[PDB]
C-alpha cells in the first residue's frame, strides 16, 4: 500500500541526537480512490488512486466519465496499489497520515535522462590503453566484442553504448524523518530518483 | 548467553499425514507464546 507524491528538493537538518542528516522533501498530497478492483471481477484486488487536480480542458471524455462515476474531482495522475487494510470504497480520500506509523518507505521514480551514452559512462569500461604510449584513437573504445571463428558471433547481453537513464528505479528502506499533515509533507533521509517536480510512488 | 532459546513442536502435514518438525530460536522470555 502507498500514496503518490511529488519531489520538491533536498536540504539538510540536524536531529535531536545532534546528527546532520540529508533529507528529501516530498509532497504526498491527497489521493482519492478512483476505482476499486476486486477478485470476482478483475482477477486481483488493488486500489487506483488519483493525485493532481486537472482542469476539464485537459481531461478527455472517456476519463471524465471515469471520475464522474466515482464522484470525485478529475485528477492528472493515476496509479494502483495493493494490500491495504481498512477497505476504502469509491471516492475516499487518503493523505500523509497514512505514513504516520511508518518507519521506512520505498520510493519508486523515474531517473534523470542522460540520452545516448558511451560504454565508459554507461557501463564503467576501463578504456583502451593509456592516454600516451602509442595511443591513437581508442581512448574511450569498448575493445574486443567477442572471440574468433568459434562462437563466430556477438553474444546476447553484450554491454554496448545506448540510451541511459529516464527509466523506472526503486530505492528501498528510506528512513522517515517527519510527517507534516498541515502541508501534506513527508521527510525522508537520503535521495530519491528523478528531477524536481517528478511524480513518485511511496510504498509503506 | 541467556539471549535466546530453542523451541520444537511437531505438526501433522497435509501432504503426507505424519508429523514434521518446527524449529526456531526465540528470546528466552517468549517460548510460552510459541507453545
Amino acid at each position: 500500500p502507498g500514496l503518490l507524491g511529488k519531489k520538491i528538493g533536498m536540504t539538510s537538518v540536524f536531529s535531536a541526537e545532534g546528527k546532520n542528516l540529508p533529507c528529501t522533501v516530498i509532497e504526498v498530497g491527497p489521493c482519492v480512490v478512483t476505482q476499486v478492483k476486486t477478485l470476482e471481477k478483475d482477477g486481483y484486488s488493488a486500489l487506483q488512486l488519483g493525485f493532481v487536480d486537472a482542469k476539464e480542458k485537459h481531461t478527455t471524455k472517456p476519463l471524465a466519465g471515469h471520475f464522474k462515476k466515482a464522484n470525485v474531482a478529475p485528477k492528472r495522475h493515476l496509479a494502483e496499489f495493493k494490500n491495504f487494510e481498512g477497505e476504502h470504497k469509491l471516492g475516499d480520500v487518503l493523505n500523509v497520515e497514512f505514513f504516520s506509523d511508518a518507519d521506512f518507505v520505498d520510493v519508486v521514480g523515474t531517473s534523470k535522462g542522460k540520452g545516448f551514452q558511451g560504454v565508459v559512462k554507461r557501463h564503467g569500461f576501463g578504456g583502451v590503453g593509456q592516454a600516451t604510449h602509442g595511443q591513437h584513437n581508442r581512448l574511450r573504445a569498448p575493445g574486443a566484442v567477442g572471440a574468433c571463428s568459434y562462437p563466430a558471433k556477438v553474444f546476447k547481453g553484450t554491454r554496448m553504448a545506448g540510451q541511459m537513464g529516464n527509466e523506472r528505479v526503486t530505492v528501498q528502506n528510506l528512513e522517515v524523518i517527519k510527517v507534516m499533515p498541515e502541508h501534506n509533507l513527508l521527510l525522508v533521509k537520503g535521495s530519491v530518483p528523478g528531477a524536481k517536480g517528478s511524480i513518485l510512488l511511496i510504498e509503506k | 548467553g541467556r539471549t535466546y532459546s530453542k523451541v520444537i513442536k511437531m505438526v501433522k502435514s497435509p501432504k503426507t499425514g505424519a508429523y514434521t518438525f518446527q524449529e526456531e530460536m526465540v528470546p528466552n522470555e517468549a517460548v510460552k507464546d510459541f507453545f
Binding site: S12, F14, G18, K19, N20 | -
Partner: protein
C-alpha cells in the same frame, strides 16, 4: 587520502623523519588510508645517530591528512600535511613525544597518542 608510494612526515621522536607507504592494510583492494588507519611503511630518511635505520620496514598509524575528514556533527578538519607515527610489533608506539596536532579520530583507536600530543584538533 594516502595510498601506496605516498610520503608522510614522521611525527614522533622515533628517529625516522620521512616514510613511504607500502601498503594500506585491511582489504583486498582497499585504496586509501585516513586518520586512525594502519599502514606499512619503509623509512626513507633518519636523523644522524638514531635507533631505527634508513630502509627499515615498519607499521604506522596516520594522525594528520591534507584531505578533509568528515565528522557526524557536520564539521570537517584538514591539516597542512600528512603525518604518521611508527608502531612496534606489539602495537605500541616506538617513541616518546608527538610533534604537532593530532586528530580526534584517534580517541577511539589509540589513547597513547592522544595523552601525549600537544593538541587534539
Amino acid at each position: 587520502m594516502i595510498q601506496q608510494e605516498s610520503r608522510l612526515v614522521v611525527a614522533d621522536n622515533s628517529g625516522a623523519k620521512e616514510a613511504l607507504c607500502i601498503r594500506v592494510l585491511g582489504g583486498t583492494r582497499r585504496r586509501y588510508a585516513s586518520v586512525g588507519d594502519i599502514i606499512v611503511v619503509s623509512v626513507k630518511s633518519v636523523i644522524p645517530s638514531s635507533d631505527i635505520k634508513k630502509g627499515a620496514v615498519s607499521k604506522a598509524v596516520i594522525v594528520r591528512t591534507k584531505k578533509e575528514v568528515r565528522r557526524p556533527d557536520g564539521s570537517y578538519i584538514r591539516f597542512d600535511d600528512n603525518a604518521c607515527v611508527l608502531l612496534n610489533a606489539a602495537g605500541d608506539i616506538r617513541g616518546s613525544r608527538i610533534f604537532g596536532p593530532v586528530a580526534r579520530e584517534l580517541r577511539g583507536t589509540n589513547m597513547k597518542i592522544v595523552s601525549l600530543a600537544p593538541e587534539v584538533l
